[PDB]
Design an enzyme around this catalytic site. Sequence first.
Site, PDB file in Angstrom:
ATOM      1  CG  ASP A  49      -7.062  -0.857   0.668  1.00 18.48           C
ATOM      2  OD1 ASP A  49      -7.028   0.164  -0.045  1.00 18.48           O
ATOM      3  OD2 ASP A  49      -6.128  -1.224   1.405  1.00 18.48           O
ATOM      4  CB  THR A  52      -2.823   5.980  -0.988  1.00 17.74           C
ATOM      5  OG1 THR A  52      -2.337   4.636  -0.953  1.00 17.74           O
ATOM      6  CG2 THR A  52      -4.124   6.050  -0.222  1.00 17.74           C
ATOM      7  CB  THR A  53      -0.296   3.946  -5.561  1.00 17.26           C
ATOM      8  OG1 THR A  53       0.045   3.171  -4.408  1.00 17.26           O
ATOM      9  CG2 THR A  53       0.818   3.845  -6.578  1.00 17.26           C
ATOM     10  CG  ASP A  58      -1.739   1.279   1.382  1.00 23.01           C
ATOM     11  OD1 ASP A  58      -2.458   1.691   0.449  1.00 23.01           O
ATOM     12  OD2 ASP A  58      -1.609   1.867   2.472  1.00 23.01           O
TER      13      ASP A  58
HETATM   14  N1  LIG Z   1      -6.796  -6.474 -14.212  1.00 21.57           N
HETATM   15  C1  LIG Z   1      -6.409  -5.191 -14.391  1.00 21.57           C
HETATM   16  N2  LIG Z   1      -5.979  -4.759 -15.593  1.00 21.57           N
HETATM   17  C2  LIG Z   1      -5.592  -3.489 -15.788  1.00 21.57           C
HETATM   18  N3  LIG Z   1      -5.597  -2.555 -14.825  1.00 21.57           N
HETATM   19  C3  LIG Z   1      -6.005  -2.850 -13.571  1.00 21.57           C
HETATM   20  C4  LIG Z   1      -6.442  -4.218 -13.278  1.00 21.57           C
HETATM   21  N4  LIG Z   1      -6.790  -4.240 -11.980  1.00 21.57           N
HETATM   22  C5  LIG Z   1      -6.590  -2.994 -11.483  1.00 21.57           C
HETATM   23  N5  LIG Z   1      -6.120  -2.165 -12.431  1.00 21.57           N
HETATM   24  C6  LIG Z   1      -5.783  -0.730 -12.254  1.00 21.57           C
HETATM   25  O1  LIG Z   1      -4.891  -0.540 -11.155  1.00 21.57           O
HETATM   26  C7  LIG Z   1      -5.155   0.710 -10.520  1.00 21.57           C
HETATM   27  C8  LIG Z   1      -5.089   0.548  -9.007  1.00 21.57           C
HETATM   28  O2  LIG Z   1      -3.748   0.659  -8.538  1.00 21.57           O
HETATM   29  P1  LIG Z   1      -3.311  -0.082  -7.183  1.00 21.57           P
HETATM   30  O3  LIG Z   1      -1.944  -0.662  -7.423  1.00 21.57           O
HETATM   31  O4  LIG Z   1      -4.456  -0.962  -6.759  1.00 21.57           O
HETATM   32  O5  LIG Z   1      -3.135   1.075  -6.080  1.00 21.57           O
HETATM   33  P2  LIG Z   1      -4.131   2.324  -5.947  1.00 21.57           P
HETATM   34  O6  LIG Z   1      -5.491   1.686  -6.049  1.00 21.57           O
HETATM   35  O7  LIG Z   1      -3.807   2.860  -4.578  1.00 21.57           O
HETATM   36  O8  LIG Z   1      -3.766   3.246  -7.079  1.00 21.57           O
HETATM   37  C9  LIG Z   1      -6.545   1.133 -10.957  1.00 21.57           C
HETATM   38  O9  LIG Z   1      -6.469   2.403 -11.606  1.00 21.57           O
HETATM   39  C10 LIG Z   1      -7.017   0.095 -11.949  1.00 21.57           C
HETATM   40  O10 LIG Z   1      -7.489   0.736 -13.133  1.00 21.57           O
END
Ligand SMILES: Nc1ncnc2c1ncn2[C@@H]1O[C@H](COP(=O)(O)OP(=O)(O)O)[C@@H](O)[C@H]1O
Lengths: 154, 535, 154, 523
Positions: free
Chosen positions: D388, D90-91, D57
């Site tokens: 989360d 938060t990223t 996270d």
């Molecule tokens: N299977 C997937 N394929 C492509 N993008 C994805 C997938 N799952 C999640 N995402 C993308 O990852 C992002 C989330 O980043 P994450 O590493 O979970 O940290 P944060 O949610 O804090 O930014 C989202 O914008 C989402 O669009």
Amino acid sequence: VTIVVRGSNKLVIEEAERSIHDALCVIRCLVKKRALIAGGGAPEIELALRLTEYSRTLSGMESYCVRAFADAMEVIPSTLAENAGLNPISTVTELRNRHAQGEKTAGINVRKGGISNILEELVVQPLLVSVSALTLATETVRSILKIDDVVNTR
Amino acid sequence: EGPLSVFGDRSTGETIRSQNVMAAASIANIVKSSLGPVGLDKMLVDDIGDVTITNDGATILKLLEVEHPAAKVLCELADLQDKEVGDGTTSVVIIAAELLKNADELVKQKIHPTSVISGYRLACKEAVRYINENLIVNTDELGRDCLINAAKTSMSSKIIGINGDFFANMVVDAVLAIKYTDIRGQPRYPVNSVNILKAHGRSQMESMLISGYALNCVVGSQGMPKRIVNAKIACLDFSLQKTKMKLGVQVVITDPEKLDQIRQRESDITKERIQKILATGANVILTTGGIDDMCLKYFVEAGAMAVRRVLKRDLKRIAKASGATILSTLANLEGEETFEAAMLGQAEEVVQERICDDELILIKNTKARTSASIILRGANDFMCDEMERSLHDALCVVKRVLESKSVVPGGGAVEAALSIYLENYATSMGSREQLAIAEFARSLLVIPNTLAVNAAQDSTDLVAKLRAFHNEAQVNPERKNLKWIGLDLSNGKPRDNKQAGVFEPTIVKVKSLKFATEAAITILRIDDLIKLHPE
Amino acid sequence: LKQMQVLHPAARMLVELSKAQDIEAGDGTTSVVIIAGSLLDSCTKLLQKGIHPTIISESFQKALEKGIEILTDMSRPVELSDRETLLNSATTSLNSKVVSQYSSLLSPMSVNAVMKVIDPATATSVDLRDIKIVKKLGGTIDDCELVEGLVLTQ
Amino acid sequence: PVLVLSQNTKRESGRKVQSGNINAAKTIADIIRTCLGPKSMMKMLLDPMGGIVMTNDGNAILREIQVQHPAAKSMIEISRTQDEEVGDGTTSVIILAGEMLSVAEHFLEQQMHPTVVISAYRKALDDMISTLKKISIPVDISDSDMMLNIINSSITTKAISRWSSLACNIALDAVKMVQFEENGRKEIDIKKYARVEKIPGGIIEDSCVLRGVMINKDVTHPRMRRYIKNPRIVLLDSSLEYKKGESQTDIEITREEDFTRILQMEEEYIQQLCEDIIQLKPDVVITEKGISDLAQHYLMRANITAIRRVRKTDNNRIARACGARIVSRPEELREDDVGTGAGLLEIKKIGDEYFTFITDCKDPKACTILLRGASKEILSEVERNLQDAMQVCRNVLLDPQLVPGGGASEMAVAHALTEKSKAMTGVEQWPYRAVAQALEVIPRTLIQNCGASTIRLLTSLRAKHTQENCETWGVNGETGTLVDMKELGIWEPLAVKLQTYKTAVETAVLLLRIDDIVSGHKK
Ligand SMILES: Nc1ncnc2c1ncn2[C@@H]1O[C@H](COP(=O)(O)OP(=O)(O)O)[C@@H](O)[C@H]1O
Ligand SMILES: Nc1ncnc2c1ncn2[C@@H]1O[C@H](COP(=O)(O)OP(=O)(O)O)[C@@H](O)[C@H]1O
Ligand SMILES: Nc1ncnc2c1ncn2[C@@H]1O[C@H](COP(=O)(O)OP(=O)(O)O)[C@@H](O)[C@H]1O
Ligand SMILES: [Mg+2]
Ligand SMILES: [Mg+2]
Ligand SMILES: [Mg+2]
């Protein structure tokens, strides 16, 4: 009665309070002794002139000392001439010359930048101030002249 | 040295004078970069790691550590300008420093300081007299437009700059909601009676104005209700805890059978009070003292809200707004204790709201008088603090405008007009005060120069254009309307600032001139410094 | 003189001298020190010439006795019913300070106070503890006022 | 001596300050950008107390770092505000703020004043918001499958994805058990009534959500029953023992019989107290304070089970679950304050330790979550992931809107801004486009973490979004191809995107206005 003093800073407030105290004490002095005298250096120069005349009467070493006393009274006018950017030698000589031939209210005018009658400028002061100043100064000098040693104690 | 054994250091003559001037200059050079709609902000970090972001002159000068007296004078000048008026705390320092510099330039020539002081006093008096011709009556203009323009002008150069319309409407509504009904000789507007709360989170455009009051407090127990529709409010100024005898009284027991009835009484007296309050239909009880857990159960069972540890000033504002009465005791003009229903306030709704992981309390639509509050949202704490500091200035400016019905153009029209007028008026004196009056007029001209310099524009040409226009205004009466052409910084050209809508209260200019002249005079008189050694 | 810390034993008497004047007159605190310094300066040449300090002291006393008479002959009587003379004396005592520019406001006030505390028919002195000065920050020097009543700070 | 004016304060000014601030912000963004997308790798950190944090996270990374430059402090603060407001994203906010601050020095170095850039950014934020609201999609909250889909799409990035179909269910149930309406119309999903208890050991598939609560306590006396079928529960806030008053009480005795007499009265007191409870005929007594031994004797004679020294939070949760309310004086105990909504009370041993379960409630408004696993660090990470997921569920319940994921929204908004910017004139045209092209750092990063050719994929996606109805096309973050989000099924709430954009733009605006720094000024 109460006086409320206002100002934009602590320092100016303190100086204003001191000035008001000065004026109050001056009026008190006027109440104590109902007498008035001319300011602007006139008393000192007249004192020096009359004591210089008086010195000629005396005979012996005493005469010298009296003359010295007279020469120690012209410091006040000279200072007043120096602080205003005037020429001290000429100003004091003119003061003495004008005091030696009649009128005894001449003095230094900083508004005019020269020598003129002082009552026409409406600057006056009590007599007690001058009398007390001279008496205390003379007594302190006489006290100082009595000392001939310094000793360090515990 | 030799003479005057003083175990200190003495400085005399031009040396000290120059030193003094330099000190003042340094202070100005700290804040000269935070003036006008184009100037930027400052960041201050202490020894442990706290960060403060601001461009308020008073706050910057208060947070700094200074030790030269000639600079502490200017710091206290900024504080006084903040207290008396609440705006223009950066321009007064610039004016005072420039006046001191120009006066020292003359005193280096054999010009006596008393002449400079008298010339400065005469120029200040005449400038204050002449400013009362540049006035505009705000009732002549449309009142709401004048107020909005004044607030929006005050808000420029702050973090809430581009949002001027939204915050200006909020500020005007909040100020008008607090107007109190005095003897009716004059109305009064007690600002800072409007509470300001900060909570980071959503964008700053989601800041809200509350028609009522907002408390940074939460309900006493989790068993209580958290919303009352028709609210009867009782304000108290004492703690609801089990009674204890005072210092003088003590209990001595010689017969055991009498012990138990004593211990019950301590738990009963306070109960008998609470019922008296609850018998009149009170729903919400506010207390500046504490409430015991034994006493919270009565409110829980009766279905009521109780809040403890309320600040005194908040209680005063709530009681005044809702029509309730603050009680420090239940005793009446007889021996007994009673609670009447005529000392209850009425509110149209009381809620506990959730904001960004914390909770607070809203009291809406009080019936005795109107009240207001503001909630400010931002990215983090530094931003929210800066917005609160910015909003205080606008509130104060609007209060000053409402109390005194006159406004003055901004951007540098006043400085140019006064410089031209005083330079013309100095000719009639024909003495050594003429030089001092001319230096006063030339020192007034530093504000438009700094405004143009911060915008990275050609200061010389723009100031020349302003002076030419105002000179053509002072003569040739048919062009008298040129005395309002200020300065436009987003394009680099003069523009009529009265129609453009750049206004400010006249009290700001008047007080700034008076205070700056006093500070310059009080510093211009020192010719000797003595600094004693530490003990 | 009090705010400095003079170390020499002789210079530690001059300060006391000024104190005495402040008690007696409230004005001329600088002039008395100037005069004492000038007299002590003039004494050096007399010491070098071979005069004895006792003769110098006696001559200084004689000169003081003559000077008091000269100054007294200079003076001019005044009556308390003439407010113009009091105003002139106050504004003269007040035009050496930072508040000279405000004299046209501070000169009358002072006089008023002294005429609201004493009985002019039998006044032989004034008690300044009957006049209370209150210092309040804010505003300018142009905001000082006279209150014929009671002022409290709590 | 040393003539000074400010006592060793350090001052800096000029373009060097702006360059330093931007560099510090970009350095902060660089630490994190490897943890975005379903291919992220973990990081392990050591805290000053000797523990270990193996996490993924962004906030959990940033809050463990000590820094000196104030810009880094501002970035950490915006990270934690994003965490508190919505609980997710938060990223991406850090990366977006870094990019938007990076694309500004190009204009700052070309003698353009910061206020122009500020105005352009503020103008672009409103259009970003409007375009985001334009492409929204409503969701029906009564369809459990769609809610499970949303939660799953939220947790496919974290470490518990291997048990996604489990965790999803858990999260949903918890939220549905805490939604609660009371006096008035105030609805709340408060998350202080959903407690997470961690017990190392066992296997992760045994984790569950109890219809009730679970405490770490044991019966006061061994003869009390450890298994009650349909108990009636009273909750006390007071102590069942004799204590001293506070009114400075003293006793003076002179007769033989008084002493013993006094010692008897105390016991009599206890008796009546116990009677005031037995009159309600309960089965379980729970108190936050101590219980005297004589009280235990009387209660056992009345066939009662007693527990001691439970926390206030646990008592509040039990009151909300079983349906009772807390009482501090037994004399004012009624029948309405006795909780009859429980269905079982049991006391078990879980690895040499006694635990108390109150389960099978009819309609509880509080719950507990029991997690098992290998060790403490794994359970801590699982706890963070569950937090989360539950926050995402609450956000979607309070605002039923959805937007495509995988980078579709960023490219759609960028195309909208690019198309709108060609209707403007003036210098502000150029900063206005910049922020638009600053929104493409989200898909790009994804591609870089998948191990694909960003130079070709980005231009292919840009060409695809140029067409008329392709607002839902994005990048498949596991293979490295372009795919429609309608079929893949990656949707996220609108609130998270709105908060992300607002926080990023406002942080950039705040940091663009600094011009000098003063340090070491002693408060
Ligand atoms: N299977 C997937 N394929 C492509 N993008 C994805 C997938 N799952 C999640 N995402 C993308 O990852 C992002 C989330 O980043 P994450 O590493 O979970 O940290 P944060 O949610 O804090 O930014 C989202 O914008 C989402 O669009
Ligand atoms: N829109 C504007 N156009 C031109 N000048 C302006 C404008 N807004 C404010 N000013 C000028 O900015 C000055 C005020 O600067 P500010 O940063 O508010 O500090 P302070 O008011 O505390 O001195 C005023 O003199 C005013 O003339
Ligand atoms: N307007 C004036 N013109 C000339 N001399 C003046 C004027 N006002 C005051 N003085 C002189 O200043 C002298 C002392 O002034 P001041 O600085 O107050 O010293 P002190 O405090 O010792 O009285 C007096 O002897 C008086 O003659
Ligand atoms: Mg301002
Ligand atoms: Mg004097
Ligand atoms: Mg995520």
